[PDB]
Amino acid sequence: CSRVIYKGTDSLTVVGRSLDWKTPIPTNLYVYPRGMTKKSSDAKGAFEWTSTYGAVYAVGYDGGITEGMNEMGLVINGLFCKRPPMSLAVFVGWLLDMNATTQQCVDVLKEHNFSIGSALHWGITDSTGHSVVVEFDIRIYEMGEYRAMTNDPNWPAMTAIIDYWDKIGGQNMLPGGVTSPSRCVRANYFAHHVKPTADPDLAVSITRSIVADASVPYTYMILSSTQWRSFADLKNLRYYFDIVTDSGIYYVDLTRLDLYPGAPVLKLDTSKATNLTGCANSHLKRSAPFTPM
Amino acid sequence: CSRVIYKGTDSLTVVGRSLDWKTPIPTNLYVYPRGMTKKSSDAKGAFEWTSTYGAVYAVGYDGGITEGMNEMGLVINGLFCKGTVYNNGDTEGRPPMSLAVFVGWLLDMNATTQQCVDVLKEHNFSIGVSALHWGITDSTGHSVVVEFDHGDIRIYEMGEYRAMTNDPNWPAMTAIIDYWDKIGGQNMLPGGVTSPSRCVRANYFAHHVKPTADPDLAVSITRSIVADASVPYTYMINLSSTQWRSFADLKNLRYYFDIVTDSGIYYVDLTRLDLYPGAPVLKLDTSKATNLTGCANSHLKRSAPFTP
Amino acid sequence: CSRVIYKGTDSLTVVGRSLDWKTPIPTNLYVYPRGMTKKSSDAKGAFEWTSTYGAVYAVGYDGGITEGMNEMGLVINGLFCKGTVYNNGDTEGRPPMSLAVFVGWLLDMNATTQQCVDVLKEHNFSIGSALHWGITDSTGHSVVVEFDHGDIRIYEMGEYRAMTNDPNWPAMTAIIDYWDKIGGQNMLPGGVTSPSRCVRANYFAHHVKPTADPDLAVSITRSIVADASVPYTYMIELSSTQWRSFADLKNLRYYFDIVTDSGIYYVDLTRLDLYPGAPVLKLDTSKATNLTGCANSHLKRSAPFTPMY
Amino acid sequence: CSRVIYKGTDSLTVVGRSLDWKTPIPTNLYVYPRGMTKKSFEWTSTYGAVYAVGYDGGITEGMNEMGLVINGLFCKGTVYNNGDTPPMSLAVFVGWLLDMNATTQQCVDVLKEHNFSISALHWGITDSTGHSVVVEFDHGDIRIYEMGEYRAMTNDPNWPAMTAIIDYWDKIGGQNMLPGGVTSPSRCVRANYFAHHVKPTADPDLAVSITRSIVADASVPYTYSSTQWRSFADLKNLRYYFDIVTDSGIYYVDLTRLDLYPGAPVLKLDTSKATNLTGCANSHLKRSAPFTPM
């Protein structure tokens, strides 16, 4: 994974994110309205919650939420990193359903009133640009001025490598490898050295170019090839998505969807959207909630 | 700018190409049929030729052919080279050949890369800064680099090399590529936007991706290689932001094209067009088509030959 | 500044170090015997201690102990660290310890690296020029001591062999671990910055042949330290290496050479009188521009250096 | 192996040279006077010179009494003879140029004739004026390149491909990043960068110390191939320094204080006995016989 934060002008913030894996990971888009009651897990002692906000989920294998953006502009991305039970399939949605800002996610995660059941670490950004890194004891790191976030190593060891290369100068040398530190240093440098703009369509084009450079070429094997990329427009509530083999990039506009209590669940089958561009709201079909694995 | 050659399986060759420049360069796609008589230049002593093969051109400013692909699978891409000097004292007088139709003259009259080598070796012309060097690849995968060293056409066989950027010249570029090859691309690669760095990365990844006989998958792989070698848009702090990218499918005769700010990538299929002599010239305005994907032969409208 | 640890065979351990600075630092060697009463500082509340072990000190400006090696094989090396903060709110009121005699205090009373860790873990002193130390005993056990805002952070060097300046040891090991995954045989950072010098020295220390020859182990350590040594008259507005030191921990030999001198010499502590009442010896390095071999005959009787309290 | 060129002020030029090999190479110093008739055709030595003779059978490098310095470095792709190419043995090829020539321009004129046939290696020649070139055999043809602004010289690849790598790393800026490996391009880039950024002086002793610090930074650690010995030639003062990496001292031979007239004896310095020698080693130059060429 490679997660980039682009802060344009006029409070415009775009969060890029690319999925790198040796095998294709079937991921579909699900739009959930408010008022839905979900369970934390299927084991004994699991708790429930009613979704306060509506959100769109990038559900991999139609079983677990890899990432998502809610109607408040809150974005949470899950990245690989080598008490009441809280499954990983609904952990991202539980924070999206109940919280509106990054600070609200930090307060709930600081309580740690849950257990979790090859692992992951998350990055949470709100519409205000406040971004943190959550890594498991739970450790919440404030990104501050950092813009990129990949897999390994941990965040303290990552910022050390970032500060080491920042003294060398990105204008002079950057690591061109596919390793997570190499992709993080490149993405962080480019995120600081691109022009800030107020146009939402241009900010996604700029964020796409940074994520493209930090992307692993497809079928790379001498095998974490980039499978797909996502870009969240936090100010305009647009969630972009594209498969690296498809011909068009499309977005789901939450401001044009019915997220009220009682609305039906919509689903975008990405396997049937190979040539779709522009807004993909009309291609959302009324479906049932995905079954947690 | 980066030019990548992808050789899949079953004689499938895809030539990627990205245009990197500070300001946007208006580029439109033109489809020329056979039997068209064109002029090399407007100066005294220019010669004429009748196009033997139909080709699609990527004409910049609607005045000069940047790159193109003919109906035989021959692809020629023009890239900048700062130290290019086109004429000397022995080229003085040889018929003038403008850079606006230089790529088209090699595409209209030649079918293979070797035919382009035989014509360029004669060097019976002069060239009239658009200091550029070219990479020519035919459907069989044979690729060469053409550079002007003070009025001297220097042709190099790419052989196992897969990438081709700007400066320095090809011999010094091959040395930098071989130097980094011993270092190990899996261990370390240059991650800058300079021409050698982009050439070393795109050459390494072109060798370490899976070859395939799928024409669509081959294009998707070439896109990912060119995307990594592409300079991020609005890179501020010469050859700056990547403005557009093109991918030519040599076996299936498809010429892909996409603007980095556009939302879709489309292609022009030459096998589904009337390439007989006398056919109308077709133009694809890349400024009008913004959300177009798949085959772009639809939005091809009838236009007139572009004016050099 | 760079610090390299070499572990050959038969418990042979050599600790190499190079001093990098813009201007030349006058450094003289002093040999102190046992039973010398010294003051931790000149301020109020300073304590005193009697030297348990005889040692050799590399005293810069003849007023402060940069590094040293006691007769037990314990070596302590002080290296600059920009982010070092010695005192905080919890250290105010503790007995003052001057940086001029801090290295000698640990070398006088302690014999192993663990004994220094226990003494530093108590932290019954306040320090009164930001540096961090590397301590190695005859057995090869080595640690890194850093003051993180009035907090003695002690890290086990473990399998790491090198130690330069900035950043701190956790961030430094993260850079070392990143480059180790690239492969030193494939690519190494060749700059004069502190992380680039540490990765090179740590790699080469692991990939040289271990030997039991005390003279070969020093020559091998010299080649690694010289590789991490900044060329002379080169500076950055991380400057030139002024001198290099090498300590043979098993044989109690302390090698020394100036980068501009034509020879390297060593002080053999086994061939010196360190009993209580022995005189303090001094070796003026400015007068040994062509001295090679054992330099015990050149040490002259001298009064103890005056610490710059 | 690395060859560094240091130009101080007041026409002061020092050429450093380190020998890197997996096994130690016995190299002794031989001071040859003028008027000696040697065999390749034959020639009578015009100038006296000191020779770093490896295995006591071949001249590795050397400096003549005119300030001309020639260093020999290994090269993997060197082919000496072809179909177009008197036999000239490599054991005396360095001496023949040092005996009959005084300037770097004189060596280029003689080698350009190529009236002779020749361990593949290439050479770097520098005269007292600072003019330096690189001589390489490319499939029988002799290629002579002007070093000009370049200061370092190692092994492979050839000089054109080496200057491209140096120029490639020059754009990055040595103050930012340098290649830290032990490969020939990495060592040549580091030595060239530092040779442009050390303060040049008129002090001949400070020049050799600065030149040593550059060559020592470009030397491969011992037992890692491993650097065996380093040499430094002071062109203006006619001093040839020499030290073994495992020894404890660095000594030199001062040609200005030696008898090089026709009829003088051949002086040999056994480096296996000067383990603790520093300063001028002229007094330790014992009289001996000319070495036996391989």
Ligand SMILES: *CC(=O)CC[C@@H](C)[C@H]1CC[C@H]2[C@@H]3CC[C@@H]4C[C@H](OS(=O)(=O)O)CC[C@]4(C)[C@H]3CC[C@]12C
């Ligand atoms: C960063 C990368 O490219 C590599 C990590 C990538 C393969 C991961 C990242 C997010 C994962 C999904 C998270 C949601 C669920 C969690 C399920 O775990 S379970 O609850 O223990 O069963 C597994 C499925 C899925 C969809 C994860 C798949 C792997 C990821 C996409």
Ligand SMILES: *CC(=O)CC[C@@H](C)[C@H]1CC[C@H]2[C@@H]3CC[C@@H]4C[C@H](OS(=O)(=O)O)CC[C@]4(C)[C@H]3CC[C@]12C
């Ligand atoms: C990707 C690169 O190599 C960077 C350079 C880029 C801006 C060039 C490369 C090809 C050029 C076009 C070639 C065709 C004509 C040539 C004309 O030259 S002239 O005849 O001397 O006027 C200029 C116009 C044009 C369209 C070139 C424009 C610049 C390029 C796209």
Ligand SMILES: *CC(=O)CC[C@@H](C)[C@H]1CC[C@H]2[C@@H]3CC[C@@H]4C[C@H](OS(=O)(=O)O)CC[C@]4(C)[C@H]3CC[C@]12C
């Ligand atoms: C690695 C570097 O860049 C720094 C090396 C060198 C310049 C330093 C290393 C050890 C220092 C000395 C330590 C002992 C005393 C401490 C005094 O500080 S005070 O007590 O606060 O006054 C200053 C003098 C001296 C001698 C230090 C000088 C600098 C060092 C030799």
Ligand SMILES: *CC(=O)CC[C@@H](C)[C@H]1CC[C@H]2[C@@H]3CC[C@@H]4C[C@H](OS(=O)(=O)O)CC[C@]4(C)[C@H]3CC[C@]12C
């Ligand atoms: C690291 C390097 O570049 C190589 C340094 C070292 C190993 C070489 C340098 C000069 C060599 C000697 C040159 C003279 C003769 C040549 C003979 O070749 S032959 O005639 O083909 O037999 C071999 C012996 C000798 C003494 C060379 C030995 C190797 C070198 C000292």
